[PDB]
Design an enzyme around this catalytic site. Structure first.
Site, short mmCIF file in Angstrom:
data_model
loop_
_atom_site.label_atom_id
_atom_site.label_comp_id
_atom_site.label_asym_id
_atom_site.label_seq_id
_atom_site.Cartn_x
_atom_site.Cartn_y
_atom_site.Cartn_z
N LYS A 1 2.81 8.81 9.66
CA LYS A 1 2.52 8.21 10.94
C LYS A 1 3.14 8.82 12.25
O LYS A 1 2.65 9.61 12.82
CB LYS A 1 2.24 6.77 10.64
CG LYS A 1 0.89 6.47 9.70
CD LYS A 1 1.11 5.19 9.00
CE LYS A 1 0.18 4.86 8.22
NZ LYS A 1 -0.02 3.80 7.35
N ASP B 1 9.32 3.01 1.06
CA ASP B 1 7.98 3.66 1.79
C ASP B 1 8.02 3.24 3.03
O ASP B 1 7.72 2.15 3.32
CB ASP B 1 6.62 3.22 0.92
CG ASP B 1 5.42 3.79 1.45
OD1 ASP B 1 5.62 4.35 2.66
OD2 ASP B 1 4.53 3.68 0.92
N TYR C 1 1.04 -1.26 -0.06
CA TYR C 1 0.13 -0.03 0.03
C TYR C 1 1.01 1.32 0.12
O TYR C 1 1.80 1.27 0.58
CB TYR C 1 -1.01 0.19 1.29
CG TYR C 1 -1.77 1.31 1.39
CD1 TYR C 1 -2.70 1.44 0.35
CD2 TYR C 1 -1.82 2.12 2.44
CE1 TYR C 1 -3.56 2.45 0.36
CE2 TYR C 1 -2.82 3.22 2.61
CZ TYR C 1 -3.60 3.46 1.59
OH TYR C 1 -4.60 4.41 1.60
C1 LIG Z 1 -0.56 3.92 5.87
C2 LIG Z 1 0.39 3.86 4.68
C3 LIG Z 1 0.38 4.86 3.67
C4 LIG Z 1 -0.67 5.98 3.71
O1 LIG Z 1 -0.30 7.15 4.72
P1 LIG Z 1 -1.84 8.00 5.28
O2 LIG Z 1 -1.38 8.71 6.33
O3 LIG Z 1 -2.94 6.82 5.39
O4 LIG Z 1 -1.98 8.69 4.07
C5 LIG Z 1 1.40 4.83 2.88
N1 LIG Z 1 2.49 4.07 2.81
C6 LIG Z 1 2.46 3.07 3.85
C7 LIG Z 1 3.60 1.92 3.77
C8 LIG Z 1 1.27 2.67 4.71
O5 LIG Z 1 1.36 2.12 5.79
#
Ligand SMILES: *Cc1c(COP(=O)(O)O)cnc(C)c1O
Ligand SMILES: *Cc1c(COP(=O)(O)O)cnc(C)c1O
EC number: 5.4.3.8
Lengths: 427, 427
Positions: free
Chosen positions: A267, A239, A144
């Site tokens: 986060k 990421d 994701y």
């Molecule tokens: C949660 C997540 C996202 C998205 O960030 P949000 O704060 O929901 O926009 C992107 N990359 C990874 C790996 C994630 O865990």
């Protein structure tokens, strides 16, 4: 176990918002369909609109590594707000958090703050394409990277949870400059490079996946990716929006010694507030406006309230024995879950690295999304509900990673294992 | 006039972040010189890091309509944060704000909270397409709707200011589905439809432009856009991220009486925190997960802090006399500024509607982006610096609408006029 208030509140909610929630996974659709509504959170616990208290393992999906409502974080915030929450011009706090992030994460020599992990990923894709001048991007099944156009193809989180496929509002004209390969398949990546020569901008992945359940990379996978992209003059992007500051202070890149060209954070970096960031090598970041032609902006980016929460959260993690404590309690909880499963006759596999764990209802081993898919979701649904009734809050999906915080105590881990026992002796 | 501390902090910021800023618009690249580093803000004022006080007309670019650091808002946030800043699960506050937004905005029947304007606009982009089944989209030249790839074509805001070209890093393939046309040109729009039958998903516009200066729609233009979209079964999308809650409680759509199908919200809805939203007809919103097939998630969307901030802000606006006061004091400012320009011998035009206004150094009138591009940029550059030294803070661009708040007093207006006279007398 009463949920009268949660039920009426979520009922009224559905008439106001799409599915009655602000993010899909909260609907509890792959685990029964009956969400509980929260009133407050503190340390390692959460409370119901009904009075029930739970030991939290979701941790607001990553942010609460220091524990919910850390005293030192909210006091720092109570002090900051008397000076205003958003300025619209530069402030000294951006400079301090920025310096902290550069020192913290290896590959980051320059940063740009944004308001979420999605925004950071939108920006990093555009940047990797602009820097190289190529349009193809290689992503992995089950990863994701935010609800973006180009990436809604075999993604993670809710996608890799309730069986959501490709597209959702994005045409074949967007999801065509993105090649997809199975996680951990070093050979499939090489194929895509030989099959589309001179047109791959780079590869992007979660160095450790948490959005298709917890999946660790194999022996020499990350090392393979770094070398192959190099040989082709392509960029390697990590990421670390979820892994960053959790697996280690400098993320997976620090822990495993593989340095990407750009990384994305989110986060934990906002300490509980909407914040994200993207950074990497200096020469690449130089293309971001106003220093360069690539445009990316954001009204609330770098706001002091956010910078404050960010700085306090990193000061707390920089303290002695932070990650050692997470690895310690998380190992006991993980091993304990797998043991209880074995003695009750349930096939399972999992693992953990620091304060991030995974537990699947299949003998496995899980190496990719397909493997993850062989789990008995019907058993997970019952396991989840039972745990919920026993006072333990788990992510309402087999395809989400679990989380631990510095506020979880040895005793908290012991009660969870006790609930897991009473529960798995059913199913 | 001293700016030594601002200069120290900025020089350092440039080694840490691209152009030393978190958003391209914060750069004084076009207005000459370096940016002013803020220290704190309160009511209608802002104080820099060197002690200079200023009467603020940027209002953190939209959010500060009730005034900076509103006491009723910050005390509400202090009580709230005590319960935790993010839950990662449903909370009753989402229902309250959602209910307030439906009530407030005419076209909104169902809402989904997101974290920013860029996010709301990106999501609505996807929804228009999922609902109509068509790929192309019509946007106007000079407008801004975030930095999502498809919108980076003939954009306003910072791209205009910095004289940046469309994009870099967004594939031609995706950029091709964006059809552009000059603002206020109904005929160019009809031509685009008649030339791409059954291919246009819809039209997205700032009902009252604020991103290529302040531009009001010509008579019949919005009613015309409503007409021609209904006729080809296409969507009318109003980007009210800047106009919402400012032009009127229900925004332009309520003020000018034209109801769209989908509208995006931001800035003021966050009350100073990162919040965004999109909503519209129920049958269209039903496509959003977990109710429909279109996936859109967000970790911090709907968090309790942001909801509290928005709830309190909307409650202050709901009071009697709100928009009347805003119109009254902004009228004097606009008119006054124009009178001074004429009296000191300068070609100028502008206007205001409620708490939004614009002032161009050109004879005018301004109907589109090209018209706006004729303003004497050098005169504005000098006029800005001059206003700055007199203690008045204006957006560092000729392509930005200026803002007013409920905290600005008749005196602040008069002091600004007195300052405008002094500065314009030289030039
Ligand atoms: C949660 C997540 C996202 C998205 O960030 P949000 O704060 O929901 O926009 C992107 N990359 C990874 C790996 C994630 O865990
Ligand atoms: C400021 C603006 C945006 C972008 O929203 P952010 O909150 O900056 O991400 C979108 N639409 C309009 C018209 C804007 O004024």
């Amino acid at each position: 176990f009463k949920t009268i208030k949660s039920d009426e509140i979520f009922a009224a909610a559905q008439k106001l918002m799409p599915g009655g929630v602000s993010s899909p996974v909260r609907a509890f659709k792959s685990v029964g369909g009956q969400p509980i509504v929260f009133d407050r959170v503190k340390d390692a616990y959460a409370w119901d609109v009904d009075g029930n208290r739970y030991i939290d393992y979701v941790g607001t999906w990553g942010p609460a590594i220091c524990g919910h409502a850390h005293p030192e974080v909210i006091e720092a915030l109570k002090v900051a707000m008397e000076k205003g929450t958003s300025f619209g011009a530069p402030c000294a706090l951006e400079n301090v958090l920025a310096e902290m992030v550069n020192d913290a994460v290896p590959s980051i020599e320059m940063v740009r703050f944004v308001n979420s992990g999605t925004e950071a990923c939108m920006a990093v894709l555009r940047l990797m394409r602009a820097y190289t001048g190529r349009d193809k991007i290689i992503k992995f099944e089950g990863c994701y990277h935010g609800h973006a156009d180009m990436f809604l193809v075999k993604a993670g989180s809710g996608v890799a949870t309730l069986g959501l496929p490709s597209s959702p509002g994005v045409p074949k004209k967007t999801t065509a400059n993105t090649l997809t390969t199975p996680y951990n398949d070093l050979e499939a990546v090489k194929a895509l490079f030989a099959e589309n020569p001179g047109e791959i901008a780079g590869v992007i992945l979660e160095p450790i996946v948490g959005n298709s359940g917890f999946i660790v990379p194999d022996a020499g996978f990350l090392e393979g990716l770094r070398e192959i992209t190099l040989e082709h003059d392509a960029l390697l992007v990590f990421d670390e929006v979820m892994t960053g500051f959790r697996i280690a202070y400098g993320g997976v890149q620090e822990k495993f010694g593989v340095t990407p060209d750009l990384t994305t954070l989110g986060k934990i970096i906002g300490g509980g507030l909407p914040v994200g960031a993207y950074g990497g090598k200096r020469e690449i970041m130089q293309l971001v406006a106003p220093a360069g032609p690539m445009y990316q902006a954001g009204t609330l980016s770098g706001n002091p309230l956010a910078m404050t929460a960010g700085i306090k959260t990193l000061e707390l993690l920089r303290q002695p024995g932070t990650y050692e404590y997470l690895d310690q309690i998380t190992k006991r909880l993980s091993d304990g879950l797998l043991a209880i499963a074995q003695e009750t006759g349930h096939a399972a596999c999992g693992g953990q690295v620091s304060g991030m764990f995974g537990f699947f209802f299949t003998e496995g081993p899980v190496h990719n999304y397909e493997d993850a898919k062989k789990s008995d979701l019907q058993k997970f649904s019952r396991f989840h509900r039972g745990m919920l009734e026993q006072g333990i809050y788990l992510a309402p999906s087999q395809f989400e990673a679990g989380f631990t915080s510095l506020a979880h105590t040895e005793e908290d881990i012991d009660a969870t294992l006790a609930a897991a026992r009473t529960v798995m002796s059913a199913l």
